[PDB]
Design a protein around this ligand. Structure first.
Ligand SMILES: Nc1ccc(NC(=O)c2ccccc2[SeH])cc1
Ligand SMILES: Nc1ccc(NC(=O)c2ccccc2[SeH])cc1
Ligand SMILES: [Zn+2]
Ligand SMILES: [Zn+2]
Lengths: 335, 338
């Protein structure tokens, strides 16, 4: 039973691999929560701690720039860089308080956003040089629109640099090549990256739109790589499940059995966080400065407009949503 | 033209004193905004960069506990400690991007809440020895409900720890006795004992600023005149004074306070309300705010993702909070001072 399960805070290095191996041994996936604010970070960590689960927090390119603020010019990725770095420091500072291991990750980065990747890496190296761990646990590349050769080459280039800090890389491959992702395509991703380090996961195109979901193809990848490596391991790969919301428990179940360790579903969470604040539409009569239907012409509506009151409703409704995912992915109780 | 006017990010030590001396001399005060989230930090920093102004960000005990999460038990001030620390790293990390000096401060901390103060000072000291600077620019102590000699005494001991780091202390004193407005005699007692330790401190007196009695910013002039003669200096402002919680004061009441040497003004309610308004005004798109099924174009065939994305509606509250902050930076003549 790996030490990572009894740690609290952001985890790095071997702790990330041990966590993902544990997920595969025990048959569970860990949801990946896009976070855009201290308030969405809080809702995710709280859902995870209350369900005694590990969790992945990730910033997308736009989430990271929202952490910087939308009024910060982002023509040259300076806002995604600075904001991903500020979220990283915030999350590291508060995450230990929730008593759970946390994987700090960054989301889709296609070729035209590699300057944002570049900025995080430099920061990671800096941090790594003075503290012994990088700043982010994990990064994603999504060169799936490039040729698979170019995607694999560029991933590998970045991965070499990432492997010096034992940092995890998630990479996405699609159906471009030079319909689903063929198992031999996935294996070429494995062949290059495994040469550098084992610390990497693959998001393949298996009907997950983001005409039908084909989670069993993830098993064909695992079987193909099984026979190529000559191993008895059921799961030679670490697999990731992107988007395509509305998939049922059986679909998530065959994907997890086939070695998926991580599931991103961001429209679910975005909508969930709105509802609690949105339903604070019933208190609209008490939502002007003094003037309230309840009593006074003259009442102080301060106990109603305090953001600590209403924002907490979105946190509450996001956290419940994440609690559902945590059970559906069998990650509840796993610590 | 002090250096601090040209710096980006959270400022410390003497840069704080410089900023306040420059506030006192050019006749402006600086709004202190309560933050409870990254979103609300962003709103304050954006309004200050947009209006070329320095700004103070502060976490109340409850705001700091909010940054940790309401789900985090706070019986021993634990949420308030972790949350303010985590706000400090976040604010320190993002503030340089907005290009303005930022005072990172903490709000009203009474006797019962001193564990929160202990936990913050503990973290400032570790961080100081690692880096040469504390986490927080300044901290506030509010022991006004305690006897006045007990207030000056606890505040002197804490101020002696903060002065190793060059940290700024703001202390509040009320109308209590121990051996109706704060007397200039009583105010000078505070200055007497704290100034021996370091000059990096400001004072919040009870001058009718409810939080019977009328608002009297003229007594803060009485404070300066009393101290000035009792010291011998000939400068107008031997005290750094702060204006707490001035519910709807006039422009002239604020001008009186500023010219009597107030450098810092906080009023929490307005910001809170302003942040809400922008988000509350996304009640005009209620019909687009359930999943997948939109009134406007097509039910269960037109997606609502682009409207319920929090990056959209939260921004609206940010924008209306910064407009109010911008109006406050005008009112306190802090606009454009960089
Ligand atoms: N009924 C139901 C359906 C789907 C889900 N999955 C999620 O929410 C999820 C998954 C990954 C990341 C974030 C979330 Se909020 C949870 C519950
Ligand atoms: N018309 C008007 C009246 C008062 C104010 N003052 C403020 O807002 C303020 C002051 C201090 C701290 C935060 C804010 Se939002 C601003 C505008
Ligand atoms: Zn993808
Ligand atoms: Zn006060």
């Amino acid at each position: 039973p790996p030490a990572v399960l009894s740690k609290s805070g952001v985890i790095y290095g071997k702790d990330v691999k041990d966590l993902f191996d544990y997920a595969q041994e025990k048959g569970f996936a860990i949801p990946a929560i896009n976070v855009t604010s201290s308030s969405t970070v809080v809702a995710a960590l709280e859902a995870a701690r209350d369900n005694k689960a590990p969790i992945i927090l990730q910033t997308s390119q736009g989430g990271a720039a929202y952490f910087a603020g939308k009024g910060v010019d982002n023509k040259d990725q300076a806002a995604s860089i600075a904001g991903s770095i500020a979220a990283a420091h915030y999350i590291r500072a508060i995450a230990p308080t929730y008593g759970i291991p946390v994987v700090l990750h960054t989301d889709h980065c296609a070729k035209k956003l590699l300057p944002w990747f570049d900025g995080m890496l430099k920061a990671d190296e800096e941090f790594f040089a003075k503290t012994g761990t990088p700043l982010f646990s994990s990064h994603m590349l999504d060169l799936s629109e490039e040729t698979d050769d170019e995607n694999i080459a560029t991933s590998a280039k970045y991965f070499e640099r990432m492997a010096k800090m034992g940092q995890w890389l998630e990479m996405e491959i699609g159906i471009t090549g030079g319909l689903y992702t063929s198992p031999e395509t996935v294996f070429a991703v494995y062949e290059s990256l495994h040469k550098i380090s084992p610390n990497f996961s693959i998001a393949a195109a298996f009907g997950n739109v983001h005409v039908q979901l084909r989670p069993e193809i993830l098993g064909d990848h695992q079987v193909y790589a099984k026979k190529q490596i000559g191993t008895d391991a059921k799961h030679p790969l670490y697999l990731v499940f992107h988007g395509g919301s509305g998939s049922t428990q059986e679909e998530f179940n065959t994907a997890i059995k086939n070695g998926v360790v991580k599931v991103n579903l961001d429209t679910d969470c975005q909508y969930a966080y709105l509802t609690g604040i949105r339903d604070y539409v019933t208190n609209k009569i008490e939502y002007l400065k003094a003037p309230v239907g309840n009593p006074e012409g003259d009442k102080p509506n301060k106990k109603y407009f305090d953001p600590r009151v209403w924002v907490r409703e979105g946190e509450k409704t996001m956290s419940k949503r994440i609690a559902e995912a945590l059970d559906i992915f069998h990650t509840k109780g796993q610590l």
